[PDB]
Amino acid sequence: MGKITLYEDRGFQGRHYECSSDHPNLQPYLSRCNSASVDSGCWMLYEQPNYSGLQYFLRRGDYADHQQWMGLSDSVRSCRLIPHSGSHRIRLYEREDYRGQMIEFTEDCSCLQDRFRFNEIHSLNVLEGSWVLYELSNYRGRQYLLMPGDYRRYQDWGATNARVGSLRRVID
Ligand SMILES: *Sc1ccc([N+](=O)[O-])c(C(=O)O)c1
Ligand SMILES: *Sc1ccc([N+](=O)[O-])c(C(=O)O)c1
Ligand SMILES: O=C(O)c1cc(S)ccc1[N+](=O)[O-]
């Protein structure tokens, strides 16, 4: 299970809604989201309905404004409870379709290029667990939730480029 309370206004003010599960469409309920309290679960907030647009990873804790989840705006129109995983393993590849140099991680990586000297990651195999891939180092820029499965090209994880600077496990 999980539980998040979404507030329209900064600092946990305004109209609010308590969500226990995936909600593909917040628009009837919240016209904006400027703070959130995550009681439990790892959540992905989405700028757009039906889990599209900019994605923001949130874990347990309180966020007094949208900048605290790296939000570019107060637009939150869907949210997903990310399934718990008990282990994490990801392979990153230089080229598409699992070709070229590969590196395999089981831990968080704040600076990819420190370990794998490629600015671009063209395919990846998420063998175990859910991960968040970040465009920039130190968990900045655009975020992309990765669930277990095969990603033969960067389009498969919802990005418009292959730039990857950091990545983290979805874990408590
Ligand atoms: S990814 C994640 C975050 C928080 C929690 N939690 O317990 O609050 C879980 C979990 O319950 O597995 C997972
Ligand atoms: S993959 C990776 C890159 C950078 C760092 N770092 O500390 O800067 C690590 C780490 O040691 O956790 C991992
Ligand atoms: O109570 C809920 O859990 C609830 C949550 C959201 S996010 C929107 C509508 C809801 N209603 O109407 O039940």
Q: Are strands 3-9 and 35-40 parallel, antiparallel or unpaired?
A: antiparallel
Q: Residue 109: helix, strand or coil by DSSP?
A: strand
Pick the CATH number of 3-82 from 3.40.50.720, 1.10.3720.10, 2.60.20.10, 2.40.50.140: 2.60.20.10
The H-or-E segment that residue 104 falls in is strand 99-105
Ligand with an atom nearest the CA of residue 138: 2
Asked if the domains 3-82 and 89-169 are classified in one and the same CATH topology, the answer is yes
Distance 43 CA to ligand 3 centre (A): 16
CA–CA gap between residue 45 and residue 29 (Å, rounded): 15
CA distance 170 to 12: 25
**If you measure from the C-alpha of residue 40 to the centroid of ligand 1, how many angstroms do you get, rounded to a whole number?**
6
Nearest 5 degrees, angle CA 62-CA 65-CA 66? Answer: 105
What are the structure tokens assigned to 88, written together? 């994490």
Choices 3.40.50.1970, 2.60.20.10, 2.60.120.200, 2.60.40.10: CATH for 89-169: 2.60.20.10
Amino acid at 8: E
Rounded distance from Cα 82 to ligand 1 centre (Å): 9
Nearest residue by C-alpha to atom 2 in ligand 2: 109
DSSP state of 111: -
Q: Which residues pair with 101 in a beta bridge?
A: none
Alpha-carbon separation of residue 60 from 4, 38, 63, 153, 162 (angstroms): 9, 5, 10, 31, 29
Give resolution in angstroms: 1.8
Q: What token pair was written down for 65?
A: 């404004």
Q: Where are the domains of the chain?
A: 3-82, 89-169
Distances (CA, A) of 81 to 18, 19, 28, 69, 145: 13, 9, 19, 15, 11
CB atoms within 10 A of CB 56: 24
Question: Residue 169: nearest ligand to its CA?
Answer: 1
